[PDB]
Design a protein around this ligand. Structure first.
Ligand SMILES: [Mn+2]
Ligand SMILES: [Mn+2]
Ligand SMILES: [Mn+2]
Lengths: 153, 154
DNA sequence: TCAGACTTCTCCAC
DNA sequence: TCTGACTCCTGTGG
DNA sequence: AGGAGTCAGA
DNA sequence: AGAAGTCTGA
């Protein structure tokens, strides 16, 4: 549980609201209990010509990785515990994507209790539905009603 | 002049490095002195759905305007004096676009003397060239060499 | 002449 | 089983 | 920007 | 994002 400086959070929040991304998605996975798994991602995108700016971000946040997919590099943070601690400190400064951040923090906290009952898991998938709604979702496939249909068995 | 908060300039600078833009242009103008107009510009682009975010910027910055361009809206500020005052305070927090700001501040400061001699104007035009190079320039047309062509004809 | 307001275009960086 | 690192695609909003 | 997907080790 | 432009009043 490392603590981040206010000025670092201030600048970064503005960068995240612009070119950053807070993603929640439901992934198909037969080996898991309900054939579906939850993935929370904190994403910052920048062209590889400025990969360095994403590299400092790894050192400054402390945790996370950076990957290239051609002309574009991406800072990513999917690890649950650091994700929570980070978004908790970044949240008050978000102006555009504040809702999504708090919606993720809500999911991460309800992660244990959501593996219990099917109706509870679908309730958490509902929280995922809200995040993609707030985002400019265009390529989404697996939603809460996708889980529901498979969960009719 | 107006003094801006540090928490405001910190966030915004991050947002400028993200979705903001700092432009320098050489506009062709037949009625001008050297047949060319200079236009320094500070832009923030966002989806029209989030126009309210750009609207607040007019309030928090105190100047500037917000127009549409399809599904996209733009916050603009080309007014020479509050632009100098704004970027002067914004610059120390920029990371990705700090060089572009300090060049804009350079041009604006040496603007009145830029009309004296063609050689003093051309030099300022190469300072516009530097700015475009730093930017992800794609569809540019008028450059410092475009001026040189027109000017060295007379 | 000049500078401020306003509109349009386009390619890649998200 | 299950988390997390990793890669790849798509369509705008920069 | 916002998803889709794979895969190995724990 | 980073340009290209028009037009008006002073
Ligand atoms: Mn953006
Ligand atoms: Mn950008
Ligand atoms: Mn952007």
């Amino acid at each position: 549980n490392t603590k981040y400086n206010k000025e670092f959070l201030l600048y970064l929040a503005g960068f995240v609201d612009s070119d950053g991304s807070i993603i929640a998605q439901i992934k198909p996975n037969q080996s898991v209990k309900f054939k579906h798994r939850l993935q929370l991602t904190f994403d910052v995108t920048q062209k590889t010509q400025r990969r360095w700016f994403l590299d400092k971000l790894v050192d400054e946040i402390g945790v996370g990785y950076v990957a290239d997919s051609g002309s574009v590099s991406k800072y990513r943070l999917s690890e649950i515990k650091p994700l929570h601690n980070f978004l908790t400190q970044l949240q008050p400064f978000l102006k555009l994507k504040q809702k999504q951040a708090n919606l993720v923090l809500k999911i991460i906290e309800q992660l244990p209790s959501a593996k219990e009952s099917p109706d509870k898991f679908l309730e958490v998938c509902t929280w995922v539905d809200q995040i993609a709604a707030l985002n400019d979702s265009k390529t989404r496939k697996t939603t809460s009603e996708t889980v529901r249909a498979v969960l009719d068995s």
